[PDB]
Amino acid sequence: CPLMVKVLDAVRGSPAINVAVHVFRKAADDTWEPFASGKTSESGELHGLTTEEEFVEGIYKVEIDTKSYWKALGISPFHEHAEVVFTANDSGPRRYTIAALLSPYSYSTTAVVTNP
Amino acid sequence: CPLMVKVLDAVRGSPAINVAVHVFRKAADDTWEPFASGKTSESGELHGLTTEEEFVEGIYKVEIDTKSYWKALGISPFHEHAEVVFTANDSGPRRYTIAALLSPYSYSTTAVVTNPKE
Amino acid sequence: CPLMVKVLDAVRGSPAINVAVHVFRKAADDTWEPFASGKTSESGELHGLTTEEEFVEGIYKVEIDTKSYWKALGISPFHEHAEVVFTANDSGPRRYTIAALLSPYSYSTTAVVTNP
Amino acid sequence: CPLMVKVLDAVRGSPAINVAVHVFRKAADDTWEPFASGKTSESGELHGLTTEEEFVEGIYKVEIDTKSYWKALGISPFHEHAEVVFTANDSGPRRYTIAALLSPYSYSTTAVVTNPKE
Ligand SMILES: N[C@@H](Cc1cc(I)c(Oc2cc(I)c(O)c(I)c2)c(I)c1)C(=O)O
Ligand SMILES: N[C@@H](Cc1cc(I)c(Oc2cc(I)c(O)c(I)c2)c(I)c1)C(=O)O
Numbered sequence A, C: 001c002p003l004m005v006k007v008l009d010a011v012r013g014s015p016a017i018n019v020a021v022h023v024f025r026k027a028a029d030d031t032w033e034p035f036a037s038g039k040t041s042e043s044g045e046l047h048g049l050t051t052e053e054e055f056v057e058g059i060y061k062v063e064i065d066t067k068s069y070w071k072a073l074g075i076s077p078f079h080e081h082a083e084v085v086f087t088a089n090d091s092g093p094r095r096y097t098i099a100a101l102l103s104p105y106s107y108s109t110t111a112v113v114t115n116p
Numbered sequence B, D: 001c002p003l004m005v006k007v008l009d010a011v012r013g014s015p016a017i018n019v020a021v022h023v024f025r026k027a028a029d030d031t032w033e034p035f036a037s038g039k040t041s042e043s044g045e046l047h048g049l050t051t052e053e054e055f056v057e058g059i060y061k062v063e064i065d066t067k068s069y070w071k072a073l074g075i076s077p078f079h080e081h082a083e084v085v086f087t088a089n090d091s092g093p094r095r096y097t098i099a100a101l102l103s104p105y106s107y108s109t110t111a112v113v114t115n116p117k118e
Helices: A066-071 B066-071 C066-071 D066-071
Strands: A003-009 A020-026 A032-039 A058-064 A079-088 A095-103 A106-114 B003-009 B020-026 B032-039 B058-064 B082-088 B095-103 B106-114 C003-009 C020-026 C032-039 C058-064 C079-088 C095-103 C106-114 D003-009 D020-026 D032-039 D058-064 D082-088 D095-103 D106-114
Touching: A003 A020, A003 A058, A066 A079, A066 A095, A079 A095, A079 A106, A079 B082, B003 B058, B066 B095, B082 B095, B082 B106, C003 C020, C003 C058, C066 C079, C066 C095, C079 C095, C079 C106, C079 D082, D003 D058, D066 D095, D082 D095, D082 D106
Parallel strands: A003 A095, B003 B095, C003 C095, D003 D095
Antiparallel strands: A020 A032, A020 A058, A058 A079, A095 A106, A106 B106, B020 B032, B020 B058, B058 B082, B095 B106, C020 C032, C020 C058, C058 C079, C095 C106, C106 D106, D020 D032, D020 D058, D058 D082, D095 D106
């Protein structure tokens, strides 16, 4: 749909599968409120988290439980989890892909905003 | 110091100067408590946030305002900020070096933990 | 096919399209010899560069002309180009995806080796 | 010095110690000429490769043997090495800091160029 997540493992060089992803929308009260969640698939992807009709402009936060994932491989991670806060103001493009590359002591995240 | 931050700019090939950094500590009520703040210097570093005595066990959050940095450069970035959450000094004290590499639609962070020997 | 390349732009947050990619195979003489080439598509991907029958074990080098790409956006790049040398010993998995994330002064590359 | 390398380990949260680095310069015949070599120290840094006089205009290649590093750690990595190709001091001399962040199936590199004022 209009919001996709992709997670990869930099240690094994494979998609990070079955990771818990939680999405939040900043509400007026300025707190974070549940929006959507899921666990990444076998190809380290999470789709159809939302629809265009309910994905309105605003501030969203995507939180990835990197800790649980690393513990499970029996590796001691640094981060409690990874977060990505961005303003989604679909004024042009439509699709957003939040990609994160994980390592026990580091993680990189990039956003690919396209139109088709 | 126990806590050090290093920020680099991937578009210019330079350290990230005047980037504001806010550090919080997860309060006793699962509330985030301001713990320290600063701005990266000419070398994109920030030392002097805290001391050994002040820096006790707990979950800390280092928030880097990447947004203000880019905006003041003519580029509108994707992210609002960059935040690193971690548990510190649970096995006696350590030295943490939180490093970030910035790009308008991406950023990378890694941590360097060294044992003072305590 | 069994070798895929993906390129992304970290400055515009979009796929890096129409980038020249050249692949080499280290020959006995130990020099690099032409193997395959292409320009990334509209989604910053390059597929069907080879086939299983001709992708044999050995040392391959994937070179991405990051310079030409950055010059075209009128940005001064640091690197002359990005390279990725790896040993492909399909003894297990089959597919290799060489992903590279570009920035005028930096580039990260990760490999996703899967089986389906 | 004009040329400095910094290597970090993303799996351990530490500098990359004893990593071999070879530097080449594109010879007059489009041949790579060995220019300097070293090994990262306890702080995952390598200084003293060259001098201002020695380091003239040209295209250089910094090759980091990431493979030997990982192997000597029990992990078999994806890449054979990590190489950074760039043109240096074409607009009078500069100072270059080639930094790499290593992972078994990934690695990141960025450069920090500063003007000595020449
Ligand atoms: N006192 C040091 C400060 C410094 C610490 C680190 I640790 C570092 O290394 C990286 C490597 C990568 I890859 C990054 O993305 C990032 I951010 C930092 C660099 I350069 C500089 C000095 O100024 O000499
Ligand atoms: N089904 C989606 C899945 C997908 C998105 C991305 I974006 C991607 O590319 C990278 C490149 C680097 I470098 C990373 O560190 C990471 I994480 C992902 C890859 I492979 C796959 C699609 O193909 O559109």
